[PDB]
Ligand code: HEM
Ligand code: HEM
Ligand code: HEM
Ligand code: HEM
C-alpha cells in the first residue's frame with residue numbers, strides 16, 4: 001500500500017487500542033500495526049524524493065520503522081500475559097516514535 | 107543520593123550531551139546518567155508515600171527506571187562506533203521516557 | 213522457498229561468514245540469512261502438522277525466527293562500524309538460537 | 319563476594335531452577351542470580367590481570383554480565399505471568415551466555 005494508507009492504518013489501530021475490552025482485540029490491532037510498519041519500511045517520503053537510497057537520511061528513515069516494530073513486539077508480550085492495561089499504556093507511549101520521525105521527515 | 111539530586115544529575119548530563127564535541131564526552135555523561143537511574147530505582151516518590159512496596163504503582167514506577175537504563179545502554183553502543191551525531195539524537199529522544207513517568211508520578 | 217531450502221541457505225551462510233575477508237562479504241551473507249529467516253517465519257514444520265495455527269507450539273516456533281532476526285540485525289551494526297572480527301563472533305553465537313529450536317521441533 | 323563465590327551462586331541456582339515446584343521458588347532463585355551477576359560486573363578475572371580497566375577485553379567482559387542480567391530479567395516476567403515451565407526453559411538457555419564468556423576468559 002502507499003505511504004499515506006499505511007500511516008492511516010497505524011493511526012486507526014491506535015484508537016482501536018484505547019477502546020478495547022479484551023486481549024484478543026489488542027492482539028489483533030497490534031498485529032495489523034506491525035504489518036503496516038513492515039510494508040512502509042521500503043517507501044520514499046515526499047520530503048526526501050531527491051536523495052539517494054544509500055543516503056543517511058534514508059538510512060535513518062528506515063531505522064525508525066525497525067524501532068517501532070521493536071516496540072510493538074514488546075507490547076505484544078504484555079497482551080499475551082493477560083496484563084491488558086499495561087499493554088494499552090505501552091501502546092500510547094508509541095506516539096514518541098511517531099512524532100520523532102514526523103519532526104524530521106513529515 | 108535522594109531522589110531530587112538524582113533527577114538533577116540526569117537533567118544536567120542531558121544538557122552536557124547536546125553541547126559535546128567528541129565520543130569520550132558523550133560516553134562520560136551517559137555513564138553518569140546510568141548510575142543515577144540505578145540509584146533512583148529504589149526510592150519512594152512523594153505522591154506515592156501511602157502505598158505498599160508491592161503495589162502496582164510502585165512496581166510500575168520501578169520498571170520505568172529499567173527502560174531508561176535500557177535506552178541509555180543503546181545510546182552507548184552508538185558512541186562506541188564513533189557515530190557521535192546519532193548518539194546525540196538518541197539522547198534527546200530519552201525525554202519521552204522522562205515525561206511519561208512525570209505525567210503519572212511527578 | 214520451502215523450509216528445507218531456507219535452512220540450507222542459513223547453514224551455508226554461517227560457513228561463508230567464518231571464512232570472510234572484508235565487511236562487504238559479511239554484510240552480503242548476513243543479509244541473505246535475514247531474508248531466509250523472514251520467509252521461514254510463516255512455514256509449518258512436519259513435527260507440527262497436526263496443530264492449529266493459533267496453537268502455543270506454532271506461536272513459539274514463529275517467535276524463535278523473530279529472535280534470530282534481531283540477533284542478525286545487531287551483527288549488521290558491527291559490520292557497518294568496521295568491527296569485522298566482533299561481527300564474525302556474534303555470527304557464531306547464533307548457533308544457540310538454531311539449536312534451541314531444533315531441540316523442540318526438528 | 320569474590321568472583322569464584324559469585325560463579326558458585328550462579329551455578330547452584332541454575333540447578334535449583336531445574337528442580338523447582340512453584341513460581342515463588344523460581345522467582346527467589348532468579349533474584350539471587352541477578353545480584354550475583356551485578357556484583358561480578360566490577361571484578362578483574364585472573365586471565366586479564368595485566369590489562370587496563372579501559373581495555374576492550376575488560377569492556378567486553380563487563381558487557382557479558384549486562385546481557386546475562388537482561389536475560390534473567392525477561393525470565394522474571396515469565397514467572398510473574400504464572401508461565402512457570404517457559405521460565406524454566408528460558409533459564410536453561412542462559413548457558414549460552416555462560417559458555418561464550420568462559421571460552422574467551424575463563
Ligand atoms: C504509530 C505511529 C504513527 C502514526 C500513528 C502515524 C500517523 C501519521 C498520519 C495520520 C499521517 C498523515 C498521512 C495523511 O496525509 O493522510 C502521517 C504521515 C507521515 N508519517 Fe507517520 N505515523 C506514525 C509513525 C511514523 C514513523 C515511525 C515514521 C518514520 C519512520 C513516519 C513517517 C511519516 C511520513 C514521512 C509522513 C508523510 C507522508 C506523506 O505526506 O505522504 N510516521 N503519519
Ligand atoms: C533523563 C530523564 C529524566 C530527567 C532529565 C528528569 C528530570 C527531573 C527534574 C529536573 C525534576 C525536578 C526535581 C526538583 O524538584 O529539583 C524531576 C522530578 C521527578 N522525576 Fe524525573 N527526570 C527524568 C526521568 C524520570 C523517570 C524515568 C522517572 C520515573 C520512573 C522520574 C520521576 C520523577 C519524580 C517522581 C519526580 C518528583 C521528585 C520530587 O518531587 O521529590 N523521572 N525529574
Ligand atoms: C542459523 C540458524 C539455523 C541453522 C544453521 C539451521 C540449520 C538447519 C539444517 C541444516 C536443517 C536440516 C535441513 C535438511 O534436512 O536439509 C534444519 C532443519 C530444520 N530447522 Fe533449522 N537451522 C537454523 C535455525 C532454525 C530455527 C531458528 C528454527 C525454528 C524457529 C529452525 C527449525 C528447523 C526445523 C523445524 C527443521 C526440520 C525441517 C524438516 O525436517 O523439513 N531452524 N535446520
Ligand atoms: C549462569 C551463568 C554462569 C555460570 C553457571 C558460571 C559458572 C562458573 C563456574 C562453576 C566457575 C568455576 C569457579 C570455580 O573455580 O570455583 C566459573 C568461573 C568463571 N566465570 Fe563463570 N559462570 C557463568 C557466567 C559467566 C559470565 C557471563 C562470565 C563473563 C562475563 C563468566 C566468567 C567467568 C570467569 C572469568 C571465571 C574464572 C574465575 C577464576 O578462575 O577465578 N562466567 N563460572
Ligand SMILES: [Zn+2]
Nearest residue numbers: 063066285289
Ligand atoms: Zn538497529
Ligand SMILES: [Zn+2]
Nearest residue numbers: 073077275278
Ligand atoms: Zn519476544
Ligand SMILES: [Zn+2]
Nearest residue numbers: 169172391395
Ligand atoms: Zn521488564
Ligand SMILES: [Zn+2]
Nearest residue numbers: 179183381384
Ligand atoms: Zn549491549
Ligand SMILES: [Zn+2]
Nearest residue numbers: 213251252254
Ligand atoms: Zn514464502
Ligand SMILES: [Zn+2]
Nearest residue numbers: 319357358360
Ligand atoms: Zn562487590
